[PDB]
Design a protein around this nucleic acid. Structure first.
Ligand code: NA
Ligand code: NA
Length: 327
DNA sequence: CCGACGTCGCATCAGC
DNA sequence: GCTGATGCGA
DNA sequence: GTCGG
C-alpha cells in the first residue's frame, strides 16, 4: 500500500487523533483514531466508501461517515473548523514541545501564551524539562539516520564497558529491528550485581561517564532505574554540527533483562501477537517476566530467563531475529 | 448498556 | 516536612 | 470512537 492510496484519509484521522489527545484530553479516542489510521494504512485498496472501510477492525459507524464526507467533498467540516480555531490549534501546537502535555498547553493558551515566541518571552514559567524541549524543539522533530544511530551506539557501548566491563547494554527499539531510521535511542542496561532479589549507583555512573566525554548534554529526568536526556555526536570537525537527540537509558535486573529487551524491541503489533499467543500455551508475558498459569488462572513464580530465545522456548516456537519482528 | 482501551518511573504539586 | 495524585513520556 | 461482554 502506497501513501497516495488512502493517505488522504489517514492524515484526516491522524489530525483528528491529535486534537483528541491534546485538546479534548480524550486519550482513548486518540488511540481509537490512530488504530483506524493504521489498519487503513495497511489496506491495499483505494477505499471507495465508508461502508467498505467499516469492514476493518478499528473502524465503526462514526469514522465511516467521515470517510464518506471526505470522499464526497475532499475535506471534513469539523477538522476544517478546528484547524482554523485560534485556541485549539495553539493548544495542539504547544504540545509538540517535549515536556508540554495537553494540560500545560491548556494553561499557556489560557493566559495568552500561544507560540514558541511567547514561550521564549516567558521561560520562568517553564520547568526544566520544558526548557529543554523548547531549546531543542526542531532537533527533536528530526529523525535519526541508522548511520548516526550506529555511531551513537558505538559511543554508548564503549563508554559503558569502560565504566565496568561486566555491564551489559543493548540499543533496542526499531533500531535493533534493522530500521533505516529512528526517532530516538533506547538503551537497556544490566549488571550481574543487580537482581530482583538484591549498588544503588549503577545507573548514575554510566550517565556520569557519558556526560564526561560530552556525549550526554542535558537531563530531562533521572532516578535509580531510568534516565531520560539529550545527546549529540561529536561535530565532525569543521563540518556542520549534529542535531541533539533524545536518549533513554534504563537499568533492568539481570533476571528480567532479556524480557525487558524482548519487550522494548517490539514491534507493538509483534508484541501483542506474542503475548496473546502465549496465553493459549499457558504463559503470561509482561515487560518483566514470564509466569505459568495455572488451571484456574493463578500465576506461579516467574520462570528463569537467561536469553531472548529462552522465552521463545517456553512457549514452543522457533526464535525470531529482531529483523523479522514487525508483526 | 456500559466499561475497557498498557503501564509505570520520574518530576511536580496539592493536601496535610 | 511527608504522603501521594497528577502530568508527562514511552 | 470501537469493540464486546
Ligand atoms: Na467494524
Ligand atoms: Na509534548
Amino acid at each position: 500500500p502506497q501513501e497516495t492510496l488512502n493517505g488522504g484519509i489517514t492524515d484526516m484521522l491522524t489530525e483528528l487523533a491529535n486534537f483528541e489527545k491534546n485538546v479534548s484530553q480524550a486519550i482513548h479516542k486518540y488511540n481509537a483514531y490512530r488504530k483506524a489510521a493504521s489498519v487503513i494504512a495497511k489496506y491495499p485498496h483505494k477505499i471507495k466508501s465508508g461502508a467498505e472501510a467499516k469492514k476493518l477492525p478499528g473502524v465503526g459507524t462514526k469514522i465511516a461517515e467521515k470517510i464518506d464526507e471526505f470522499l464526497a467533498t475532499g475535506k471534513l467540516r469539523k477538522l476544517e473548523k478546528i484547524r482554523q480555531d485560534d485556541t485549539s490549534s495553539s493548544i495542539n501546537f504547544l504540545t509538540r514541545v517535549s515536556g508540554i502535555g495537553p494540560s500545560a498547553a491548556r494553561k499557556f493558551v489560557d493566559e495568552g501564551i500561544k507560540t514558541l515566541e511567547d514561550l521564549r518571552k516567558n521561560e520562568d514559567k517553564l520547568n526544566h524539562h520544558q526548557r529543554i524541549g523548547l531549546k531543542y524543539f526542531g532537533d527533536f522533530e528530526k529523525r535519526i539516520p541508522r548511520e548516526e544511530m550506529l555511531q551513537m551506539q558505538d559511543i554508548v557501548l564503549n563508554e559503558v564497558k569502560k565504566v565496568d566491563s561486566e555491564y551489559i547494554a543493548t540499543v533496542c527499539g526499531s533500531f535493533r529491528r534493522g530500521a533505516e531510521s529512528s526517532g530516538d535511542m533506547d538503551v537497556l542496561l544490566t549488571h550481574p550485581s543487580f537482581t530482583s532479589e538484591s549498588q544503588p549507583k549503577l545507573l548514575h555512573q554510566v550517565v556520569e561517564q557519558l556526560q564526561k566525554v560530552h556525549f550526554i548534554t542535558d537531563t530531562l529526568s533521572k532516578g535509580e532505574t531510568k534516565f531520560m536526556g539529550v545527546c549529540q555526536l561529536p561535530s565532525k570537525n569543521d563540518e556542520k554540527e549534529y542535531p541533539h537527540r533524545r536518549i533513554d537509558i534504563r537499568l533492568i535486573p539481570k533476571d528480567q533483562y532479556y524480557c525487558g529487551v524482548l519487550y522494548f524491541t517490539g514491534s507493538d503489533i509483534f508484541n501483542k501477537n506474542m503475548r496473546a499467543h502465549a496465553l493459549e500455551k499457558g504463559f503470561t508475558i509482561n515487560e518483566y517476566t514470564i509466569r505459568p498459569l495455572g488451571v484456574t488462572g493463578v500465576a506461579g513464580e516467574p520462570l528463569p530467563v537467561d536469553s531472548e530465545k529462552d522465552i521463545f522456548d517456553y512457549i514452543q516456537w522457533k526464535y525470531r531475529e529482531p529483523k523479522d519482528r514487525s508483526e
